[PDB]
A paper describes a structure:
Analysis of the reference free 2D class averages and subsequent 3D classification indicated three principal types of complexes corresponding to different stoichiometries of Hfq (hexamer):Crc:amiE6ARN with compositions 2:2:2, 2:3:2 and 2:4:2. In that common core, the interaction of Crc with RNA leaves approximately half of the accessible surface of the nucleic acid exposed. For the 2:3:2 and 2:4:2 complexes, additional Crc units are recruited through interactions with the exposed portion of the RNA. As such, the C2 symmetry is broken by the third Crc molecule in the 2:3:2 complex. The two additional Crc monomers have small surface-area contacts with the rest of the complex and are likely to be comparatively mobile, which may account for the stronger variation in resolution for the 2:3:2 and 2:4:2 maps compared to the rather rigid 2:2:2 core assembly. The 2:4:2 and 2:3:2 maps were sharpened locally with LocScale and LocalDeblur to better resolve the additional Crc components. It seem likely that the 2:2:2 core is formed first followed by recruitment of the other Crc components.
As a member of the extensive Lsm/Sm protein family, Hfq shares an ancient structural core that oligomerizes to form toroidal architectures exposing several RNA-binding surfaces. Crc and Hfq act together to translationally repress mRNA target genes. To gain insight into how P. aeruginosa Hfq cooperates with Crc in translational repression of amiE, we determined the structure of the complex they form on the Hfq binding motif of the CCR-controlled amiE mRNA using cryo-electron microscopy (cryoEM).
Residue numbers in the entry:
A (entry chain F), M (entry chain J): 6 to 70
B (entry chain A), E (entry chain B), O (entry chain R): -2 to 259
C (entry chain H), G (entry chain D), H (entry chain E), K (entry chain M), N (entry chain I): 5 to 71
D (entry chain G), L (entry chain N): 5 to 70
F (entry chain C), I (entry chain K): 5 to 69
J (entry chain L): 6 to 71
Write the structure that this text describes.
RNA sequence: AAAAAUAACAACAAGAGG
RNA sequence: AAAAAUAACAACAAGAGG
């Protein structure tokens, strides 16, 4: 796979992410943790996002694997 | 309860519709205000008693050259005022606007140049559309309510035409035309009467003279009742009766819950 | 799955008012009462069911703590 | 499937009118005749085959419980 | 025929007004939706059966700190939905917005911060004002009708205050406060439900607690029913009673020509 | 998959004018010639392959079964 | 998959110019040459790989047959 | 099965600047830097990931075919 | 004085539609029936009297004299 | 002069008039009496409308001038 | 001539409350104490002189008739 | 003629600070220092000339007697 | 006086004027002829402007008196 | 008639940059060329005519002599 | 096509800029309005026919003590109006405001007392700016879109000076005056033409009379084109040249994308 | 708290929420 | 074709017609 090590390395180094949904809307925060169907996103409140609604994950800084 | 019926048939000549059976139909429809666009007859040719529907007051504003415009309005109740002209040159001279002022609402009738006669007609249509957007910007600060019974010759959306991909280049579905009707209906707040009670597809107001373009219902929707926002909740019915027609255009019959007064 | 069940069940137990955003941008505000593998019931004033394939995100109105 | 099925079954065998909101916003109000793992058949003037990957929410007119 | 009454009294604490006989008056006014702002009570305080009017549902929205805002809503028939909070921070945190979605209309209950204590409240008021304008820019695209029964704490015109020359500096009649209501009512197209029927003067909705200012009637007007443009022809009887007041404010009873439905 | 099979088979073998309302709001009206999983075929002047993961509803225009 | 593989294979052997309609409504015109369980290759001035999860209908320009 | 991964590896090797199209109808240019079975990555200025469930189409900018 | 009555009588005789602007911006519009030293009267549908001390201008619809 | 016969003919027949002032305000009533300078009309209380503030006087029934 | 001096002098000597409406819509409550054929004087706190060429109407709150 | 002449002379003698209101609503504080049949001189930080036909009311601040 | 010789000089050599009304509306044109009570303006149709609506008369090209 | 014209003469001889407020509240600066019994003229860039029955107030920006 | 060039110059004396060659630059730059602050001359001094530029109109307002103030304005066509001064004695006695008045826009040259001859002139500057803010409180309601060519002698924010740590106490960078001009030209919504094209500093308009300041470059950006927010989005070009400078200040050349007309 | 449904935008680097 | 009426904007160089 690729999403699991990439989101692990996006989590542990506290990379701020901008997440774009299939409706076109933008979410921002750190990743808390993730699972086969969900991503939990931290900002003003602990938020849940469903993987089946995310189009893209855009980091703030360059991250590497 | 209180009801009101308003008809906005484009006639392409009140004489041709009269010999094809317009008045014998409009007497038997029981409407309060009948609006007619492209009368194509001078005001001396209308007070001839061939055109008087019984029990209806007739008010007409012709064009200067009596073949290019001319717009009539029958009304059951006698209005408080009957005015003509929008103030700019392409309506005051070609006779493309008449208005009957009543108690709280005022019903006006409106014609636009089609832009299918030539390129200069499309320039005239663009001038009329721009300064009529200026007039609707001027009317936003006023306190009456308006029912513009227009034959705008602009199809608003893809639902309003059959085979919309073939029609992008033809006038009636150009991008400034659809942008104009997305400015008036979307941004200026004015409501469309036929869209408030029915959003089905194949409802059209105009057919070209090919019989092939009539059996396959290759239509366009050009007839509208533009409404101020204080009337978008009073519309009960809005239908375009396809078959009993007296021109290229279809009649547009709308039932409102308003009690029209004097 | 693993983070899925712990979150929704804790919003269920403590009566936290949620705002489920569906994939159109419709905000259904309410209160998670129960959920299976596929649907979530919420109770604002009439108890409705919500399919998870039509959900984009769940945002609470106050924080929640997960083990 | 533990909570998918008894809710629609209580909507089914009691013949109470329901309101299905689809994924683009279309509401479809009528009755539920039967359902599958993938399909609901709605009842109005004619029956409908609602695929349940387009359904979003289900609002009953009067409330039910399992 | 059809009728609907909505009352929007401000209570200055529902506990201090329930001792003064608020609920026994609201039971006898025959209202369909009763709007209450500045409740100053928690979520379990309105669960106690002192406030449960029979034949009504009671929904409330409390603050984090229960002394600052809190807004409640009684209803005759059950809403389709009841949501809270405008989405930004100076609205939901303090319990200042509660919205009841019915069939075609939805009745919301809004409470602005007064801005009469100090600059910490006045800057807070201005940020609520412009973020509320920003929210109202987003509701110009939807197909619902709204009745925002607000205690906006801003008087609109020179008719809504007594001795306006002495009130240009006091908070409640400032120039960036009057321009906000001149923008909500003028440019956004919303209507004032008391101005649509009666433009008599001296209709005041608020008084300071001194006795001289309440028998010489030098009071202001803070409570409005902000209406979408689709409802400006439905108001029959908007009335501000002066004598049976249960706080510094007066009730605002508006009778409409609508049928409330689920 | 236990009660969509006789429904589409009944709409096919009686040859009624149906309308498939898609997910994005488009209706396609015509008549069903064959039904399978993942795929329905809508027959008209042209015969097209509609996928089943883009269909909201299927309706016949006159009451059948 | 009892019919989409013969339908697309008959549609590529006869070299039919076809219109793919996407589920947001983007008419792609081209000529389908190779197709998977998942993807369909569309030849034009370029050679695109379209996914089947974003296709609503596949419309040919002339009537085709089945063996 | 077998015609998606060779095409996608083929545009992976020669480092072609592709345009990904999402099912909301928007475009995203860039060089593909890695991929696997459920997400296609896209190296622009930043290194982002793009789900396949929400990729509408994959188009190259110059005609290269698959071996 | 010497210019007002031939102008109003020219507008009255040929039944020329005039647009009387008032001093507040209200465009009355109709035909002139008669006039005197102080009051004109115009008809659109009902005949009304209009005092001359509220008339800003008088605008005919077609050029005369 | 049609000023004074028009107002007398509205007065004898007792026609309900509507008087539009110079600021858009209308005042509906019946002309009781008038001078060369003022006009007394009654709807609820008797009221002395000055003529220098009248723009128009429209009658509700159509009238005839002698 | 003969129809405003009985009206104004009758509202003097019976001391009715009047409301004088100006030609910009302003309403002035008081009582008519004195008048020539050019001005009206009225009183509630301080005796003001309202000019007659900016009075649009004179409306008494109690009905009156002239002798 | 018979009632505004004493009422304005009794405000230019006692120099009462008057508040003279125009016909469009504009308020003008000052002191009346002269008046003929047509104009009124209003003295303040500058001394200006107000025509009588633009004046609606003339109020004083403290009450005066004719 | 000074009014009537001014307007006579304005109407002889046909100055394009802008007449500003008391409510603010400006009206441009050439002064055809006038009298004691009205001023008859003309650019595209002769309109009878009453003097008691006229606040100012503004000539564009500065004239001698 | 007995007090206006010496005031306008004293404003005429000395070039006092006077200001004229109209009855709708429009402010016209300038100097007084000449006047008659109905009209004041205004000296600025282009010489204006202004009727007295639209003039509200004449105010000099210079403290000048009273008649 | 579109070109509206106005250039604001602080000559610090017409007699002083007459020796360097001001007029041979003004004729060549092709500007539609040339605004001048600190003309420092009487009116009959500018009646001397050596001073007028070719093809333009000259207007000027004098001081009483003539070397202290006085402003001027050059315009290609004669305007509708030339109004002088605001109406209060710390702007008319010393003559620091002159406004030519065209259609849809008006150009006003604005000058302030310096504050560089003691604390009393700094208090004079605060008093003049106080009455100027009270003036904009009356001007915030018109529709004449205003362009104020003004020498305010105060830089707005941090990057409009160099070495501000010592310059906190010099006249021009006072912390109450900075915060108060942030309060004024904030909420009132006015703008400048400089910030619409460049959000970085390093562009200046005042220097002391010492080459010690010139090879070290401590700067002061003073000259503004105050723009009411209808012309916020219509700055065509704006440039500050510190090479052919005609005094202690530098010119300010601003193109606006309209057509100035009468 | 949602258009009983646009026979269909060769494609809005994306509307912290239509 | 017009707010049964703003106890009153020390004053919109002026809305081809509020």
């Amino acid at each position: 796979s690729l999403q699991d090590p990439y989101l692990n390395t996006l989590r542990k180094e506290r990379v701020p992410v901008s997440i774009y949904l299939v409706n076109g809307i933008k979410l921002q925060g750190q990743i808390e943790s993730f699972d086969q169907f969900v991503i939990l996103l931290k900002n003003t409140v602990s938020q849940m996002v469903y993987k089946h609604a995310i189009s893209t994950v855009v980091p703030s800084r360059p991250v590497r694997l | 309860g209180p009801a009101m019926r308003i008809i906005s048939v484009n006639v392409n000549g009140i004489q041709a519709a009269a010999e094809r059976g317009l008045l014998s139909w409009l007497q038997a429809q029981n409407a309060d205000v009948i609006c007619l666009q492209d009368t194509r007859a001078s005001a001396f040719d209308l007070d001839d008693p061939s055109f008087q529907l019984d029990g209806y007051f007739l008010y007409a504003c012709d064009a200067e050259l009596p073949e290019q415009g001319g717009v009539a309005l029958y009304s059951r109740l006698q209005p408080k005022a009957v005015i003509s002209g929008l103030g700019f040159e392409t309506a005051d001279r070609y006779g493309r606007y008449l208005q009957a002022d009543f108690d709280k609402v005022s019903i006006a009738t409106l014609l636009l140049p089609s832009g299918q006669s030539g390129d200069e007609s499309l320039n005239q249509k663009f001038k009329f559309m721009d300064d009529f957007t200026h007039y609707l910007s001027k009317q936003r600060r006023k306190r009456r309510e308006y029912i513009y019974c227009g034959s705008l010759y602009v199809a608003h959306q893809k639902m309003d035409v059959k085979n919309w991909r073939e029609c992008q280049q033809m006038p009636g579905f150009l991008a400034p035309e659809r942008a104009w009707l997305d400015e008036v209906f979307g941004n200026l707040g004015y409501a469309d009467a036929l869209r408030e009670v029915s959003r089905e597809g194949d409802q059209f107001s105009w057919w070209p003279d090919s019989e092939q373009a009539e059996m396959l219902n290759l239509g366009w929707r050009f007839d509208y009742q533009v409404l101020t926002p204080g009337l978008r909740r009073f519309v009960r019915n809005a239908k375009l009766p396809r078959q009993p027609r007296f021109s290229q255009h279809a009649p547009l019959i709308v039932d409102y819950d308003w009690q029209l007064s004097i």
